[PDB]
Design a protein around this motif. Structure first.
Motif, PDB file in Angstrom:
ATOM      1  N   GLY B  83      -0.522  -9.511  -2.596  1.00  0.00           N
ATOM      2  CA  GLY B  83      -0.944  -9.724  -1.224  1.00  0.00           C
ATOM      3  C   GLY B  83      -0.625  -8.520  -0.353  1.00  0.00           C
ATOM      4  N   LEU B  84      -1.074  -8.597   0.902  1.00  0.00           N
ATOM      5  CA  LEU B  84      -1.049  -7.422   1.770  1.00  0.00           C
ATOM      6  C   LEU B  84       0.363  -6.872   1.944  1.00  0.00           C
ATOM      7  N   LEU B  85       1.355  -7.750   2.099  1.00  0.00           N
ATOM      8  CA  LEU B  85       2.694  -7.283   2.444  1.00  0.00           C
ATOM      9  C   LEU B  85       3.470  -6.763   1.237  1.00  0.00           C
ATOM     10  N   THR B  86       3.249  -7.323   0.047  1.00  0.00           N
ATOM     11  CA  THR B  86       4.064  -6.988  -1.114  1.00  0.00           C
ATOM     12  C   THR B  86       3.340  -6.101  -2.119  1.00  0.00           C
ATOM     13  N   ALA B 261       4.301 -14.779   6.341  1.00  0.00           N
ATOM     14  CA  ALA B 261       4.375 -13.697   7.320  1.00  0.00           C
ATOM     15  C   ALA B 261       3.864 -14.141   8.683  1.00  0.00           C
ATOM     16  N   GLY B 262       2.934 -15.095   8.706  1.00  0.00           N
ATOM     17  CA  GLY B 262       2.313 -15.538   9.942  1.00  0.00           C
ATOM     18  C   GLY B 262       3.212 -16.325  10.876  1.00  0.00           C
ATOM     19  N   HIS B 263       4.315 -16.893  10.382  1.00  0.00           N
ATOM     20  CA  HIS B 263       5.069 -17.758  11.286  1.00  0.00           C
ATOM     21  C   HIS B 263       6.556 -17.439  11.423  1.00  0.00           C
ATOM     22  N   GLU B 264       7.225 -16.969  10.366  1.00  0.00           N
ATOM     23  CA  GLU B 264       8.686 -16.914  10.424  1.00  0.00           C
ATOM     24  C   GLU B 264       9.170 -15.905  11.457  1.00  0.00           C
ATOM     25  N   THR B 265       8.649 -14.673  11.412  1.00  0.00           N
ATOM     26  CA  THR B 265       9.087 -13.669  12.376  1.00  0.00           C
ATOM     27  C   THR B 265       8.683 -14.036  13.798  1.00  0.00           C
ATOM     28  N   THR B 266       7.560 -14.743  13.971  1.00  0.00           N
ATOM     29  CA  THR B 266       7.118 -15.093  15.319  1.00  0.00           C
ATOM     30  C   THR B 266       8.013 -16.160  15.940  1.00  0.00           C
ATOM     31  N   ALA B 318      12.774  -8.257  23.782  1.00  0.00           N
ATOM     32  CA  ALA B 318      13.424  -9.071  22.757  1.00  0.00           C
ATOM     33  C   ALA B 318      13.298  -8.425  21.379  1.00  0.00           C
ATOM     34  N   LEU B 319      12.133  -7.841  21.084  1.00  0.00           N
ATOM     35  CA  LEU B 319      11.938  -7.142  19.815  1.00  0.00           C
ATOM     36  C   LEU B 319      12.794  -5.883  19.711  1.00  0.00           C
ATOM     37  N   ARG B 320      13.158  -5.270  20.838  1.00  0.00           N
ATOM     38  CA  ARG B 320      14.049  -4.116  20.773  1.00  0.00           C
ATOM     39  C   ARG B 320      15.438  -4.535  20.315  1.00  0.00           C
ATOM     40  N   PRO B 323      14.784  -7.154  16.472  1.00  0.00           N
ATOM     41  CA  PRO B 323      13.521  -7.174  15.718  1.00  0.00           C
ATOM     42  C   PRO B 323      13.632  -8.111  14.525  1.00  0.00           C
ATOM     43  N   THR B 324      12.762  -9.127  14.503  1.00  0.00           N
ATOM     44  CA  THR B 324      12.937 -10.245  13.576  1.00  0.00           C
ATOM     45  C   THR B 324      12.657  -9.854  12.128  1.00  0.00           C
ATOM     46  N   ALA B 325      11.831  -8.831  11.899  1.00  0.00           N
ATOM     47  CA  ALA B 325      11.746  -8.205  10.587  1.00  0.00           C
ATOM     48  C   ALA B 325      12.634  -6.966  10.624  1.00  0.00           C
ATOM     49  N   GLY B 393       2.307   3.036  10.676  1.00  0.00           N
ATOM     50  CA  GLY B 393       1.144   3.629  10.038  1.00  0.00           C
ATOM     51  C   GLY B 393       0.139   2.619   9.510  1.00  0.00           C
ATOM     52  N   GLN B 394      -0.515   2.989   8.405  1.00  0.00           N
ATOM     53  CA  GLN B 394      -1.508   2.097   7.822  1.00  0.00           C
ATOM     54  C   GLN B 394      -0.870   0.854   7.214  1.00  0.00           C
ATOM     55  N   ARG B 395       0.447   0.862   6.991  1.00  0.00           N
ATOM     56  CA  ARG B 395       1.163  -0.315   6.526  1.00  0.00           C
ATOM     57  C   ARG B 395       1.868  -1.050   7.661  1.00  0.00           C
ATOM     58  N   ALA B 396       1.492  -0.773   8.908  1.00  0.00           N
ATOM     59  CA  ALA B 396       2.032  -1.522  10.028  1.00  0.00           C
ATOM     60  C   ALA B 396       1.551  -2.975   9.972  1.00  0.00           C
ATOM     61  N   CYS B 397       2.171  -3.819  10.793  1.00  0.00           N
ATOM     62  CA  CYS B 397       1.862  -5.244  10.777  1.00  0.00           C
ATOM     63  C   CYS B 397       0.423  -5.483  11.213  1.00  0.00           C
ATOM     64  N   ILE B 398      -0.365  -6.109  10.334  1.00  0.00           N
ATOM     65  CA  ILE B 398      -1.749  -6.418  10.677  1.00  0.00           C
ATOM     66  C   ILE B 398      -1.849  -7.573  11.668  1.00  0.00           C
ATOM     67  N   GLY B 399      -0.822  -8.413  11.722  1.00  0.00           N
ATOM     68  CA  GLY B 399      -0.804  -9.611  12.568  1.00  0.00           C
ATOM     69  C   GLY B 399      -0.162  -9.405  13.916  1.00  0.00           C
ATOM     70  N   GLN B 400       0.178  -8.172  14.243  1.00  0.00           N
ATOM     71  CA  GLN B 400       0.864  -7.793  15.501  1.00  0.00           C
ATOM     72  C   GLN B 400       0.237  -8.447  16.739  1.00  0.00           C
TER      73      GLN B 400
HETATM   74  C1  HEM Z   1       7.273 -11.291  15.705  1.00  0.00           C
HETATM   75  C2  HEM Z   1       6.246 -11.239  14.849  1.00  0.00           C
HETATM   76  C3  HEM Z   1       6.102 -10.211  13.694  1.00  0.00           C
HETATM   77  C4  HEM Z   1       6.892  -9.176  13.343  1.00  0.00           C
HETATM   78  C5  HEM Z   1       8.208  -8.689  14.007  1.00  0.00           C
HETATM   79  C6  HEM Z   1       6.300  -8.543  12.180  1.00  0.00           C
HETATM   80  C7  HEM Z   1       6.796  -7.441  11.509  1.00  0.00           C
HETATM   81  C8  HEM Z   1       6.190  -6.765  10.467  1.00  0.00           C
HETATM   82  C9  HEM Z   1       6.665  -5.544   9.845  1.00  0.00           C
HETATM   83  C10 HEM Z   1       7.945  -4.789  10.247  1.00  0.00           C
HETATM   84  C11 HEM Z   1       5.808  -5.199   8.876  1.00  0.00           C
HETATM   85  C12 HEM Z   1       5.904  -3.971   7.943  1.00  0.00           C
HETATM   86  C13 HEM Z   1       6.857  -4.281   6.788  1.00  0.00           C
HETATM   87  C14 HEM Z   1       6.912  -3.147   5.787  1.00  0.00           C
HETATM   88  O1  HEM Z   1       6.514  -2.002   6.133  1.00  0.00           O
HETATM   89  O2  HEM Z   1       7.361  -3.391   4.632  1.00  0.00           O
HETATM   90  C15 HEM Z   1       4.753  -6.194   8.848  1.00  0.00           C
HETATM   91  C16 HEM Z   1       3.667  -6.218   8.002  1.00  0.00           C
HETATM   92  C17 HEM Z   1       2.785  -7.271   7.872  1.00  0.00           C
HETATM   93  N1  HEM Z   1       2.730  -8.387   8.687  1.00  0.00           N
HETATM   94 FE1  HEM Z   1       3.926  -8.824  10.299  1.00  0.00          FE
HETATM   95  N2  HEM Z   1       5.144  -9.230  11.866  1.00  0.00           N
HETATM   96  C18 HEM Z   1       4.994 -10.260  12.767  1.00  0.00           C
HETATM   97  C19 HEM Z   1       3.962 -11.179  12.784  1.00  0.00           C
HETATM   98  C20 HEM Z   1       2.987 -11.305  11.816  1.00  0.00           C
HETATM   99  C21 HEM Z   1       1.901 -12.266  11.800  1.00  0.00           C
HETATM  100  C22 HEM Z   1       1.683 -13.319  12.913  1.00  0.00           C
HETATM  101  C23 HEM Z   1       1.179 -12.047  10.682  1.00  0.00           C
HETATM  102  C24 HEM Z   1      -0.086 -12.761  10.138  1.00  0.00           C
HETATM  103  C25 HEM Z   1      -0.674 -13.811  10.720  1.00  0.00           C
HETATM  104  C26 HEM Z   1       1.789 -10.946   9.966  1.00  0.00           C
HETATM  105  C27 HEM Z   1       1.349 -10.422   8.769  1.00  0.00           C
HETATM  106  C28 HEM Z   1       1.724  -9.211   8.222  1.00  0.00           C
HETATM  107  C29 HEM Z   1       1.126  -8.568   7.069  1.00  0.00           C
HETATM  108  C30 HEM Z   1      -0.037  -9.142   6.231  1.00  0.00           C
HETATM  109  C31 HEM Z   1       1.769  -7.416   6.853  1.00  0.00           C
HETATM  110  C32 HEM Z   1       1.465  -6.390   5.743  1.00  0.00           C
HETATM  111  C33 HEM Z   1       0.430  -5.413   6.292  1.00  0.00           C
HETATM  112  C34 HEM Z   1       0.096  -4.352   5.277  1.00  0.00           C
HETATM  113  O3  HEM Z   1       1.034  -3.710   4.739  1.00  0.00           O
HETATM  114  O4  HEM Z   1      -1.115  -4.133   5.021  1.00  0.00           O
HETATM  115  N3  HEM Z   1       2.883 -10.519  10.686  1.00  0.00           N
HETATM  116  N4  HEM Z   1       5.020  -7.129   9.831  1.00  0.00           N
END
Ligand code: HEM
Ligand code: HEM
Ligand SMILES: O=C(CCCCCn1ccnc1)N[C@@H](Cc1ccccc1)C(=O)O
Ligand SMILES: O=C(CCCCCn1ccnc1)N[C@@H](Cc1ccccc1)C(=O)O
Ligand SMILES: Cc1ccc(N)cc1
Ligand SMILES: Cc1ccc(N)cc1
Lengths: 451, 452
Positions: B83-86, B261-266, B318-320, B323-325, B393-400
């Motif tokens: 998947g996208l994150l791993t 990824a969609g809910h825990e950090t949010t 709050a994110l400063r 930061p939940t991730a 970068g290109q691996r930044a959070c897509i769900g931001q």
């Molecule tokens: C407070 C909310 C959020 C925070 C702090 C956060 C943080 C992050 C961070 C730090 C990364 C990069 C991790 C890495 O480089 O290994 C990331 C990637 C990602 N996040 Fe989030 N995220 C949040 C919300 C969400 C939501 C709501 C979604 C989806 C609905 C999401 C889906 C993803 C995905 C799919 C990636 C991987 C993107 C890629 O590498 O192509 N995140 N996020």
């Protein structure tokens, strides 16, 4: 369904609205009053100016719309012929030249141009470091010196030697006067009173063709081996037909690339420097990056690639003032625009690029602020919201060349000088067929970093 | 030139330093003692934790560094797959999925998500307005209810119905236990003792529960309304490069990925944001004024949320601080020198310690620990790469943008409809899984009696 239209002047329709020295800024104001689309009529012509991302994203569908030649581009055919910019997509010479010339703008081609870009960039830095106390810099003039010399040297191994001149090179004097006459033909019959104007046009076109003749003859007699734009022009063969470019088209391309290669790029550099001195937070951020990336006396190709923030600065300058402010499209078939504006086959459209880039629904409410951070993540920008280099297969072929030159030059400028807006310059945008800040001047104090 | 390194435990090197329930806060403390960079060794692995904007601004150069899979993400691959994150940036399925799914996070997609976000937000407001006298609110628990249901409804048209449950949904019970086992594989001094055998058996059962829900989500979609949500692009969207869509194995990895990824950090973000608000009544009032004047309708619209400027600054501040991730990992693409001081070989690993980066006194000044949303009024004043809660970068959070829109909508409705009380004088206790949350955070909220 019913389309707005600005005020009219009897039988002249809307044309006198264009009889001004700043027509693009006037068209922007009409867009502010009338919204995302308005009809514009002139004697013998009808067009529609689009300003919203919602409608422009449909016009950029190449299956529904093709590049149209604006009246400015039609008149420019008198010197640019069927070169890349002034030819129709269905003319044989467009696709032929497009196939032959795309390789000379690839990444490997960029790496070969880089050394000659530095040659001209160093001449700029040395001119500014040789200024006496309290002497200032005329920014747009010096930017035109650099961009013209760069396309001449990189593309054709010809040296305009603009930094050895206080007056402009005779080529651009005729270039500017020909384009000014093109401008005049827009807002204009052919009474005898215009005989001198037609005579002057023909003399200025001949001056440009004379330079082209010198460029070509020098290459034939050269004896060395070059690998630049001119080389692909003379020897490259179209993979479809197997043919090379014939003799008229090469000279049309040379004229085309000399003009297209430098004017919009010098305006971009001028606007970028204006926004930098007007925004000290941004300038500090850009100067820090230039200082830490450009660690050598001569920037390398990879080092320029690493100037991320300078590229964001340049894109934010292109957002507010895209130096080529419009392009034209025509409907290939009967179609409906935005589900509400029916168009017939052949109907024309104008994309008003400065207004598209001020779409508050896309960029938010603060469109007029200079914030390069809008471009920190490119994937955040919606599709067809940012269009400074045209669209589709008729997009700007020299885009990467222009962005590499500007990033190299701006980076060296920020590394070597501190700049002062000593006159508190009030932005004055001059309009030809492109946009430039007129009278923009700065003072630069060297950081005394040698080359 | 010589890099510091914390205390070592013989052949285990620095690994027992992680055998704690708050390892990120433990790594932050080591950073306080050792400075902007330190080496951390474990059996079979070497990495370097970065803490300063000075070095992290270089690490975020994508021409020199690429995303690395930390051990946490490597282990999470047992259920998140490619998947996208791993996934690695060079795995074919990353770029393909990135191209297909980025459109489902565009502005037009956000506008389509908005109604269903309001659906869940109203259930939250109604729960709190239906509380009896002197009853309190369990903040992180209710935030987790909302954020999980929001990604379920908006992305997949599946209703977890979290506000109809006392116990957590069976999906997250297995989800929390699976993530807990990942954390345990990290801190284990010796990784395959007999005591952990059942732990591996339970790990596999919890993955089956998560995959079983994915099967229900997919079969439910297969049995025909006409939706245009995240799942729709997953099933039908085509990569413009390769022309092909995602195959069925990868879709299942993506559903699991986005559910987690969609809910825990949010939910952690919303909990921290509400904590800082009740601890700083001047900020809470300023944000409450804005909610009152902007949200003039019984149901907030997409445009009104766009206009909640101060609430967005509240969320960024709050994110400063938390930061939940809390970290992400990078590896050197070629031999390179970091800060002109630390030579790195090709493949060398780095960790960005995000909470510590956000406390760089050279960047944020004297008051780093104070909650001041004003710091985010102008992005041009913030140095490059100083603020990295969503990666790089290109691996930044897509769900931001989806996360920031949901949280801004929810916080805005919360501030419009209730006055909040920190009736226990709650002392911040930061729980650590793979993410950060305030544990035990409770408040009392008394309604302003504004109808919906
Ligand atoms: C407070 C909310 C959020 C925070 C702090 C956060 C943080 C992050 C961070 C730090 C990364 C990069 C991790 C890495 O480089 O290994 C990331 C990637 C990602 N996040 Fe989030 N995220 C949040 C919300 C969400 C939501 C709501 C979604 C989806 C609905 C999401 C889906 C993803 C995905 C799919 C990636 C991987 C993107 C890629 O590498 O192509 N995140 N996020
Ligand atoms: C800031 C710099 C530049 C800007 C903003 C710019 C803008 C544009 C735009 C908007 C078009 C499309 C016009 C239309 O559709 O009618 C175009 C086309 C073109 N540009 Fe540029 N340009 C820049 C630099 C350059 C450079 C450096 C070169 C060459 C060295 C160049 C050569 C061309 C050519 C040949 C075309 C026609 C391409 C084709 O249709 O095949 N431009 N440019
Ligand atoms: O500016 C323009 C188009 C010029 C485009 C710029 C050319 N370029 C230079 C470099 N890359 C593109 N204006 C219209 C206005 C008009 C409307 C109706 C009747 C007459 C004139 C036109 O020329 O048709
Ligand atoms: O905290 C981390 C990374 C956690 C990232 C959270 C994942 N996430 C969730 C949502 N978006 C990203 N820690 C290191 C610790 C370690 C070092 C050396 C040896 C073993 C373990 C690791 O995982 O490798
Ligand atoms: C043909 C032509 C090319 C470029 C510019 N700026 C004007 C005219
Ligand atoms: C794979 C994965 C995604 C998100 C979180 N929080 C943990 C793990």
């Amino acid at each position: 369904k019913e389309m707005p239209q600005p005020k009219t002047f009897g039988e002249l329709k809307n044309l006198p609205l264009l009889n001004t020295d700043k027509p693009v800024q006037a068209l922007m104001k009409i867009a502010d009053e009338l919204g995302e689309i308005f009809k514009f009529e002139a004697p013998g012509r009808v067009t529609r100016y689009l300003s919203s991302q919602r409608l422009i994203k449909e016009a950029c569908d190449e299956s529904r719309f093709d590049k149209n030649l604006s009246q400015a581009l039609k008149f420019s055919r008198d010197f640019a012929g069927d070169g890349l910019l002034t030819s129709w997509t269905h003319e044989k010479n467009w696709k032929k030249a497009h196939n032959i010339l795309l390789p000379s703008f690839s990444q490997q081609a960029m790496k070969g141009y880089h050394a000659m870009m530095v040659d001209i960039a160093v001449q700029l830095v040395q001119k500014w470091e040789r200024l006496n106390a309290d002497e200032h810099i005329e920014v747009p003039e010096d930017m035109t010196r650099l961009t013209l010399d760069t396309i001449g040297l990189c593309g054709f191994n010809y040296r305009f030697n603009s930094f050895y001149r206080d007056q402009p090179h005779p080529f651009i004097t005729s270039m500017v006067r020909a384009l000014d006459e093109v401008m005049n033909k827009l807002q204009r019959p052919d009474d005898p009173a215009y005989d001198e104007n037609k005579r002057q046009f023909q003399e200025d076109i001949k001056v440009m063709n004379d330079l082209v003749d010198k460029i070509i003859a020098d290459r034939k007699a050269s004896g060395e081996q070059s690998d630049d734009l001119l080389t692909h022009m003379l020897n490259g063969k179209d993979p479809e037909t197997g043919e090379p470019l014939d003799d008229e088209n090469i000279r049309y391309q040379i004229i085309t690339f000399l003009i297209a290669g430098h004017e919009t790029t010098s305006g971009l550099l001028s606007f970028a420097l204006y926004f930098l001195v007007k925004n000290p937070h941004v300038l500090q951020k850009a100067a820090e990056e230039a200082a830490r990336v450009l660690v050598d006396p001569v920037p390398s190709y990879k080092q320029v690639k690493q100037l991320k923030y300078v590229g964001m600065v340049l894109n934010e300058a292109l957002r507010l003032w895209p130096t080529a402010p419009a392009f034209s499209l025509y409907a290939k078939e009967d179609t409906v625009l935005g589900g509400e504006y029916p168009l017939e086959k052949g109907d024309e459209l104008m994309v008003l690029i400065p207004q598209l880039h001020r779409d508050k629904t896309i960029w938010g409410d603060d469109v007029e602020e200079f914030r390069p951070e809008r471009f920190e993540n490119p994937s955040a920008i919606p599709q067809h919201a940012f269009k400074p280099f045209g669209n589709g297969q008729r997009a700007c072929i020299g885009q990467q060349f222009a962005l590499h030159e500007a990033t190299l030059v701006l980076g060296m400028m920020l590394k070597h000088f501190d700049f002062e807006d000593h006159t508190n310059y009030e932005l004055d945008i001059k309009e030809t067929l492109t946009l430039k800040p007129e009278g923009f001047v700065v003072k630069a104090k060297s950081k005394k970093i040698p080359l």
